[model samples]
Structure formats: C-alpha cells, structure tokens
Target: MRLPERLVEAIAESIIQKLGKEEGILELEDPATFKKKIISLFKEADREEKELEEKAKAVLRENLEVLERENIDYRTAFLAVKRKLAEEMNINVDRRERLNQIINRIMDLIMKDESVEIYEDPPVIRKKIREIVLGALKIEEEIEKTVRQRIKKYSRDLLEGSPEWQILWKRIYEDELKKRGLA
Candidate 1:
C-alpha cells in the first residue's frame, strides 16, 4: 500500500537535505520503487569511483614514464667522464662504484648522529668519537683514492676553474681534519 502524501513529502525533504538535491529526487518514489532507485544510484556511484581510480592510475603511470626518461638522461650525462677515466686507468669502474656506495653507507651511520648529545669526558667519548672519525675517514679516503687512482686520465689540466669547487674541496678538508684555523 502507498504511504500518505505528507509522509512522502517529509521523506523527500529529509533525503534532499541529508543526501543532496540530485540523488534525493530518486528517493521520493513509493517504498519498493525507492529501494530499486537507490540500488541503481549505488551502482552508478561504484562505476564513477572505478572510473576515477583508473584515471588517477593512468596519470601516475605517465608521471613514472617521464621520471624514468629523466633518470636515464642524468645517468648518461654523469657517467660519460667517469667511464672514460675508469677505462684509461684500467680500473674496474663497477668496483669503484661499489666502494663509493659502501663509503656512503658508513658515512650514513656516522654523520647522521653527530647532533645527538651524549656528554662525557675524553676517555669515555674517545671510543664513540673514534668510530665516527674512522667512518668519516673511510668515506674521505675512498673518495680521494678514487680521484687519485684516475688522476692522469684528465684530458687537460683539470684545473679548478670554478671557486665553488675549491670552496667545497677546502671545506671538506677543513671540517674532517679538525683544523679550526681554516674555517
């Protein structure tokens, strides 16, 4: 049996206010008819959600493609000089790269925690500081050795034409070696 006009009007107003004007219009039918209409609305919502998900996924895939292309370009540009030097020095380029990775791993452990405060005297602090210093030294030695090993591979005098390079080079030496005067 059909509900009263007032009841239907109240339900329709309640649905419109709660849900929204667009979807609530479909909810104004008789009880059985409203149930069918609401089910259809649910299916439509599911279909729209799937469409949005697919669109977002497609955009992410496109962004990844662009990133991969840029990564390839960076590798090509960076490795051009490095590969040439390794070939000239008859050194296994991959070995040097592996050593560089290891050095960075050690440094990641050391320099990452310098700011952590743990107060103690020289005897007590020595052990922890020694570990940190050794890790830092290992990183420096490996990097310097890599450069020295292929020093002659430079086409011309690989001059420090830029002050920025010198500043970085000096900064590294000063900070690591504990020479306070240089800073």
Candidate 2:
C-alpha cells in the first residue's frame, strides 16, 4: 500500500500543470514552491498512514497467541484492525473517499494562499482538481497492477508474503515507475 514518493511528486506536478493551463484557475508565480505545498499534504497523510500501520502491527504482535489459537489469517486480521483504526482516527481507508478529503484540504490551502491569483469560481477549480487527482490515482493503480503481473511472471516461485518476495516487489515496482519517467 506504499504510495511511491516519485509518484507523489508526479501527482503534484500534474495538478500544478493542469491548473496552470486554465487562465484564471490558479496563477502561481512560484509554481515549484506551490508544488511543494501540495506534496506536503500527501506526505503528511502518508506518514499518518505509516504510523497507523505500525500501530496495527504492534497490536497484532501483542495478540499473537490469541490469533494463533483462533487460526485467523494475519493478513485479514491486519486489514480489519487497520480499518477500525482508520475509522477511529477519521481517516478514509477507501481510496476515493480519501482522495475527496485530500481534494477538500487542497482547496482550503489554495483559498488561503495569498501568493496565487484565483479568478475561477471555487466549485470550478475544485472540479478540475478532482479530475486531475482521479486521473493520477488511476495511473497509480494501473502501475501497481502491472508491477504485480511482472512479479508473477518470474520463473522462480516466490511466496507473496516472504521477506524476499517483499524485496523483489519493491525493486520491480520502483523499476516500473522509473521506466515510465515517474521516478
């Protein structure tokens, strides 16, 4: 569930570039600086998610005996616990919903930014942002699927959850991103 840092930068660039095309939407004199602003939001969200996952792992480790006694799948249990924690923390574990929240926060940031000129209506700007973000996410999802397929094509069988498999997944995933010029 790791969102590549490279893709995050690409998404920020996409949003800034798209908004720049519309004459009155967002006129950031310092686009590079503004792009960092957008990236920071995602960085914070990703950090929070990482923290949540670590907390969930700790919880699972604490109850290892109970899990083994009940013969529950660790993957399923981790997901259930993660969902519960997300609910409690008011985080949207669902991608679309989470993206919506991210969009909302972005709008707020843009509105508060004194450095930019905005001539487009809030709703119009928001809609355009939504479109760009959704497009970026679609690309991200497709990349993930492609990476998984490539991993499966290896002649040597690799257990999905094994340490070696995890390492190979990251290597292949990053290679894919780099091949597409996203990294």
Candidate 3:
C-alpha cells in the first residue's frame, strides 16, 4: 500500500515501544523481521481482498444478467442472497461492521496527517470517507450474493440438495470465475 514515510515510522515505533518494556506482553525473535512480516501479511491480505472483490463484482454482473431477464429486483435478490450466505458461511456482521469502523478510523488519520490537504468542510470529508468505507464493506455482501445466486440458479433445474446439482453448480461457478480472470 506504500504508506507515507512518517506513517511507516510511526507504526514501527509503536511496535518497538510495545516490545521495549521489561514485562512486555509481546515477544518476537527479531523485531525488524516481525515488523516486516506484519506489513507483508497486511499487504497480502489487501491484495487478496481486492482480487476477491473484483471476482465478486464480476459474478454479480453475470448473475444480474440472468436475473434481469426474469424481471427480478437485483438489489432485493442480492440482499436475500447475501443474508442466506452470511448464515451458511458463518460471516459475522458485527465483525464486518467493526472492520468498517477500523477503516474509517484509518481514513480519519490520513485526513488529519500533514501530507494531505482538505479544503472541504469536516462534514464533507466525513461524508466522502463514509461513502468509500461503505463501498469497501459492501464487497463482502456482493461475494455472498454471488455464492447464493450460483446455487439458487442451478437449483432451479436440479434437486437442490442432490450431489449432481452440487457438482454442476461448483463446476459452472468455477468455470465462470476462471472466465472472468479469477480462480
């Protein structure tokens, strides 16, 4: 993500301080390596999340085409599918909302940092940040909707719980994902 130099230093210093105490709760073999590992992990997670979001949006678009043909409301269908998948996938809405809050906190930190200039009012800045955060969090729901649409669409033709239907759904879903440049 290429954070600003000061931000990087701040994060590194924070880690150092945490590990500096005699009875520090955290310990690492190599603090530098540990810091690097944390950064790498976060970068990897961010990259994978973006890839999943792209795949989710693509899947949603594909299903939307089929849905629109039947005059279904995309938003309603997407919401129902997302809720169903949330249950089956054990997706914690509370955790997701917390993550959203964390991101918003980061956004506020960036805005307050010296590097960026904000000409707009605080309300305007908050609104923009909220919009971006909301969009980012919505990707999870979109991915869930993709899963639900894939299963339900196939279930229409085959027995919903049958092995045959499950196999076909997985095959088609995987193929479509590959076609969209995802695995």
Candidate 4:
C-alpha cells in the first residue's frame, strides 16, 4: 500500500495544477509556499483516501457476513455489493486488470531504482495484491469498531437503519473522529 515518494509528489503536483487552473490563478506564488502546500495536500489526500477505503472495506465486510449467513455465494454477493458501493461512493473498485496494471507500474518503478526481478506468477501476484489491499484495509477496523460501539452505547433504543438512527450515528461518528483528531 505504500506509494513511491515520486508518485506521491507527482499526484500532489497534478492536484495543485488542477486547482490553480480551476481557480483561474495563472500566476505563480512563492516556490517554497507551493512546495509546502504540495506536501500538505498529498498528506491530506492520502489520509482521505485511506478513510474512504476503510469505509468501503467495512461495508464489504458487513455485506460478506450477511451473505454468508444467508448461504449465498460470496463472490456473487460481493461483486454486486462492491458495484453498488462504488457507485454510491463515486469511486471505482480496483478490478483484477486494473490491479495488474498497478502492480506492473510498481515493478517498473522498482526496477528503475535497483536491479530486481519479479518472478511471481500473475495469479500469485494477484492473490498477493488482494491480500495486501485487504490487510491494509483491516488496519482501520479497530477504530471503526470503536466508533460503532460508542454510537451504540450512546444511542440505545434507536433502531438500526432508521432515519433518526442513521443521522445520529453519523453525528456520533463525526464527533468521535474529531475527538480522535482524525477529522
């Protein structure tokens, strides 16, 4: 899940350029200012991306549990839920082909830095990639679990999935995030 520093910088610069163009600011400000902003922007984007990924993975995990309990095929239910989640979140889930492209790019970058050969088969690599992605996602599970517990503790008698419960859950979640300095 670790990105190359150069790739991070490139993404940050692209984001800054896009924002500048959108804001109609054709003139450059202090170089140091822009540089600092780029790093900060990259960090913020990385944080937000992780947050969103955590949320998506949490949903996926919940769906998988429900599917299993209902005796449904995991892959079938997972694919349907994944597509709906991606559409709802306005984000694309990485398909196998897309992951292949990403892994190739990473390997290419690694080769550029040192003499290295990736001997892994495509299927093996794909499985490893999925493991890594899922492992990274599991990192946020504890925090999310804590948030869910706090919400439940504070909101007894509120039916899950009800409009009032959903709204209150969101409010509690946001408050917890702020208290944890994650918001």
Candidate 5:
C-alpha cells in the first residue's frame, strides 16, 4: 500500500536518526551498512512498538468499567429489539442466557486477547466487517424463512398492513443494511 508522504518521511527520518545514516536510501547494495543500520534501528523500533502496544492497552484498561457498562447497555438495547420482535411474532425466543452467550462468543472471537488478526502484507483484518455482515445476512435469511412460513400459516391476513409485518420483513431481508448497525 502507498503510504502518505508525511508518514513515509517520518519513518525514514526515524530510521536515519536511529541508524546514524548521513543521507540517501539504505539499500542492500551496501550490505554491511544496511545490516548495521537495520540492527541499530530495529532496537529503536522494538522499543517504540512496545510503547505503542502499552499505550493501547492502557487506553483499553482505562475504560474497562465503562466498557463493561456499555456492553451491558448494548446487550440491553439489542435484546430489547429481539424481545420486541419476538413478541410481535408471538414466539418464545431464546432465553437471555443463550442469546447473550452467542453475543459474547462473537465478541470474544472479534476482540479476545487484544489479538485482532490483521493480515500484515495484504492489510486485511481476519474478521472483515464485510464478512461479518454477510454472516448476519445469512442469519436473517434463515430467520425470515422460518418466520415467513409461520406468518403464512398463522398471521398472514392480520399482518398484511401492520407495522410489525413491515419491521419483520425489513429484519428478514435488510438486516445487514438496516439492522446490522441499527441503521
């Protein structure tokens, strides 16, 4: 990927400063100079890298309580939607224990151990947002298929022009678009 000019310059300046290079590119042609410079500069990179990781961890730790609270809030808001829809459909949805277990599992897969796997060379996060949204779409489809059949048998006539029906249809097909981010 092409880096912004300022970032390229900053890294180059760091390399030069840490390696004691007078000027110009440090290429493989000057093998001895390249090796010495890399060895010296890598130490600096290691230190800086650790500092950055620590700062990120500190930020996360600083918000640990608030994060927990917000997770609860998110679960509340999310499950309220789930409960509303289930009631409208007159269905007994999964209990909170089961539902929250799935929710927490997904969050763990995404954020566990501070190790979000991003592909370095290709620059792709392992759990791409697009793929996550697609999985959600599949879920919506499965739910819709079940609910549609249910509605056809039980509530078709009454649900025709109801707000709940509209919401249900939107939930089924437009989950990634409308419901994924509560869009």
Candidate 6:
C-alpha cells in the first residue's frame, strides 16, 4: 500500500489523541513529542521501504540482458527480486503482516517510553492501536478506489499506465484525500 506521508501524519495524530483521552487506556507525559517520534519512525520505515524498492528495481535495471536470456518480463521478474530483497531485510511482503510490522515497531517505542503508563494489557493496547491505524488505512484505501474509478471514467483518452494517467491519479487521489480531511 502506498501510504502518503500526510495520511500517516494525520492518523498518528489521532492515535496519540485516542490513547491519551480514552479513560484507563494510556497516559502520555509528553504527547506532542511522542507524536513527533511516531511520525519520524514512520518516515524512517518509509525510507527503508523506498530503498528496498529501488534496490529491487536496480537489480532489474542492471540485468536487462539476463532478464531477456531467462525469458522473464519486467513486472514478473521484478516481483521475484522484490520478494528476495524483502526477505533479505526481513520485511513482510504480505500486506497484512506489513501493517503488523509497523504496529510492532510502534509498540516497541511505546514500551520504552518511561512517561507512558499503559493501563491495559498488551493485547488490549495493541488491539486499540490496530483499530485506529487500520481503520484510517482502510478508509484511505476506499478513497483511493473511488478516485481510481473516477480516473477511469474521466481519463478515457489516456492509457491507464501512461505517465499522464499516473500524474492524474496522484492529482485526483490527493484531491479526494483533502476533501475527506484524511490528509
């Protein structure tokens, strides 16, 4: 899933608010700094993800002849390389597990913060975090789907995979995100 930074930021803000405000949920001594750290953690994760993708693509870029000799197409071969790099870095290729990886990272951060007093057990706190983050991501995915459908109808002349369509997709998608106040 392509998570826009703004979407992550918005969701992070809400997660901090929910954790702090819910009675007997969790308490943060420094909510503002905590939110900043969460966002930076997300940024670091995004950085690693982007690096992994680039390395995968680079493998293909540097091995076009090998691809042709092996009778492999671009995307299919890229998927194989992508999976390999993900395994090398211990990243979860499956979407569900990828989300869990972020949640786990956040949990680690929270556990280390001495100022935070978690009132609930690990399962309860983790479930609450999952609900907030997953709910936001699911809604973002729906907004993306709606924008995609709109682009299909509106960009009839443009090939779906063309550069113009890609730009249009970003434009329409971010517009919808703004309209929904999700970004």
- Indicate the residue-level lDDT of 47 in model 6: 82
Model 6 regions more than 4 Å off: 153-167, 181-183
Report the lDDT of model 6 for residue 129: 86
Residue pairs in candidate 4 whose N, alpha carbon or C atoms collide under 3 angstroms: none
Can you write out model 6's per-residue Cα lDDT over 77-170, one digit (the tens) per residue? 9999999999999888776688788888888888898987787787788888898888888887788789878887867789876778878888
Per-residue CA lDDT of model 1 for 84-123, tens digit only, reads 5445543334533433333343233322434322233324
Per-residue CA lDDT of candidate 5, range 19-136, in tens? 2243222222343443344344434433443454345455556666876877755435444555555455433344323223323333343333232332232213222323433444
Tell me which of candidates 1 and 6 scores higher on lDDT. Answer: 6
lDDT of 2 at 72: 95
Model 2: CA > 4 A from native: 153-167, 178-183
**TM-scores of the models, in the given order?**
0.23, 0.83, 0.36, 0.34, 0.23, 0.86
Ten contiguous residues with the weakest lDDT in model 6: 1-10
* Clash tally, candidates in order: 0, 0, 0, 0, 0, 0
The positional error of residue 18 in candidate 5, measured at the CA in angstroms, is 36
Query: Considering only N, C-alpha and C atoms within 3 Å, which residue pairs clash in candidate 3?
Result: none
Lowest summed lDDT window (length 10), candidate 4: 19-28
lDDT of 1 at 45: 35
Put down candidate 2 lDDT per residue, 118-177, tens digits, no spaces. Answer: 888988988988888778788889988998799987627887767788788889988987
Clashing pairs in 6: none
Ranking by lDDT: 2, 6, 4, 3, 5, 1
Query: Which runs of model 4 end up more than 4 angstroms from their true locations?
Result: 1-3, 10-26, 70-82, 92-183
Q: Give lDDT per model, in order.
A: 0.39, 0.83, 0.49, 0.50, 0.40, 0.82
